[PDB]
Amino acid sequence: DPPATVYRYDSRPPEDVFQNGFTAWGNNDNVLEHLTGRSSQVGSSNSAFVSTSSSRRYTEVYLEHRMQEAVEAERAGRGTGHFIGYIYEVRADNNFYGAASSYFEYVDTYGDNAGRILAGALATYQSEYLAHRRIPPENIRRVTRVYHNGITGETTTTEYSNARYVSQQTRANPNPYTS
Numbered sequence: 001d002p003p004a005t006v007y008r009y010d011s012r013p014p015e016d017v018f019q020n021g022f023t024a025w026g027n028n029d030n031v032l033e034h035l036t037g038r039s040s041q042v043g044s045s046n047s048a049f050v051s052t053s054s055s056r057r058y059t060e061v062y063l064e065h066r067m068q069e070a071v072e073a074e075r076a077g078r079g080t081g082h083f084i085g086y087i088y089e090v091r092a093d094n095n096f097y098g099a100a101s102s103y104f105e106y107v108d109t110y111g112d113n114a115g116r117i118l119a120g121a122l123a124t125y126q127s128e129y130l131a132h133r134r135i136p137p138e139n140i141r142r143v144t145r146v147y148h149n150g151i152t153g154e155t156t157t158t159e160y161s162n163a164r165y166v167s168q169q170t171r172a173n174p175n176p177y178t179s
């Protein structure tokens with residue numbers, strides 16, 4: 001039963017995301033390259049997928065890693081220590097494809113003699129959903145803004161809804177992504 005709702009941590013604020021949605025980095029729709037990172041590398045940032053998770057908690061884990069990175073950067077003199085991260089709640093539709101399922105389909109076709117995802121990561125990927133090319137702003141319901149002052153340790157959480165959100169009865173695609 002594919003999720004009707006997924007979540008995405010992003011550093012981009014709602015003035016950007018609620019107007020533009022999320023857009024992928026390039027036109028490379030190779031699922032294995034997205035999941036392993038080949039299509040996310042500097043000099044190689046061309047994936048056609050926008051990642052989301054059906055687990056809000058997992059997006060909070062992502063946010064909290066980035067928060068700690070900002071705290072550590074300030075301690076080292078490479079940042080202000082003022083971190084802002086955002087968790088977006090997104091309506092999934094047939095343009096959203098399960099990562100684990102898409103991986104298994106990729107392997108069934110091309111094998112794994114070379115590119116192989118470890119079991120621990122693949123288990124996380126059961127909750128990862130890949131939106132092809134973009135997530136329109138009409139799919140984005142609301143945002144949670146998390147501010148953290150690295151120097152004082154103080155945090156706030158604030159909520160805003162997206163006026164452009166369009167309600168529809170959709171859920172993620174039940175099938176793997178195929179190129």
Ligand SMILES: CN(C)CC(=O)Nc1ccc2[nH]c(=O)c3ccccc3c2c1
Pocket residue numbers: 007008009010040041051052053059062128
């Ligand atoms: C590290 N950058 C080159 C790429 C990047 O920032 N990716 C990115 C950026 C934001 C992301 N946000 C998520 O919620 C998420 C959830 C599951 C898997 C990945 C993500 C996610 C990934």
